Amino acid sequence: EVQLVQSGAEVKKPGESLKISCKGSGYRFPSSWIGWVRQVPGKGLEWMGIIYPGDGETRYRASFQGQVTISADQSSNTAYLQWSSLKASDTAMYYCARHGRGVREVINAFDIWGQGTMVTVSSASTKGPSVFPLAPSSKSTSGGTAALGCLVKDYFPEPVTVSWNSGALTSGVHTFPAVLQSSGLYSLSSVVTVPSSSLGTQTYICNVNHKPSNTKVDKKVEPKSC
Amino acid sequence: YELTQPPSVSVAPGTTATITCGGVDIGSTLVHWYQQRPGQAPLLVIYDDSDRPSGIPERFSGSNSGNMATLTISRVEAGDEADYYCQVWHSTSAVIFGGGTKLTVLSQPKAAPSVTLFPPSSEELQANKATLVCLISDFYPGAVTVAWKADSSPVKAGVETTTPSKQSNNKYAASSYLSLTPEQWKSHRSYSCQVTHEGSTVEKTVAPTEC
């Protein structure tokens, strides 16, 4: 069976070096190109370079010249992608893929792909979240429904858990996935849609728990005095 | 050299899905198409314009001509919904992928998004950071484009947008955060979140109300 097997996930810090590998199996390794493709989580595929191991011929996208090095070793059927000085912007998934050598007897496209190697480059250390109340406003109310929530900002690492009223309130509750800010810290929000008439009677509290940092916060969300 | 794909395309089951890839004289070279599902490596579905790998079903086909290539899925099935990328070999040192297209096979009627924009709270202002929170709920298909405006001027710095996620009622939700300095929040006049979905847009604005 034709197959490309890549190396395990990598968690590095900025300024460090890295070398991930892709091993071919089930075919004659020297007689096919192997290309490397970058994909930032949630974004499109970006091609970086390609190498023919038979004679070692290597091509790079002009942007990446001097940023990475692609290599290959025939005795071990392995292609390699290496960074000398990693930077935060290098955080992404990386795929290796086999490409034909320009002949009709083979598929002249990325017909085989490795499972990918995730590379996470962050100088972030464990930090607890900050919980801010997203209070429901008079403009928010529409058809008797108001939206209110909590902002869990600047925490690391994942995950954080959020509940409302110690788990009593489930309906209308949606907790969004986390976003990675430029600071390397994570942020997310939890939202609840509730009858606007209940803002006077019912009290709403979000319970945020970040276990990695041993952080427990209970924040009350209430209407503003305007 | 760029390849232009539509961010999202939606079609009904059993009908024909078409995804278009635009490039300068792209008809002169060969175009390949890859299918990618969440959490999985791409899969070559069409190569050399119209060829099918052995395992691919006959429903997939391709075309290429002039300044336009096309991927066509006949009698589209629910299982076919995924991200799709076109790809070519333009120059010797440049292999170019398209921006990608999210294909949805309609399982429910289309729903326009509802938007809620939260300004910074007094607490966050005090901590010398500020975050405008744009929350998007109840839309299908699960694809939206967020654009932040400072007094009608597009701004892209300090923007972090979530990947759409589904809800209990099987509609999609998402969030977009615009991080600003209190200096900017007070010195500027108003900020706005503009959500685009299936060609329509919903805009909501906030200001530093003196209250």
């Binding site: 020297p30 023919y52 320009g102 | 010797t92």
Partner: peptide, 17 residues
Amino acid sequence: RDKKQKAYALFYRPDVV
């Protein structure tokens, strides 16, 4: 003119080890 071979020419390599 042969479009396929014209395309392959950009990335042709011989069967070498």
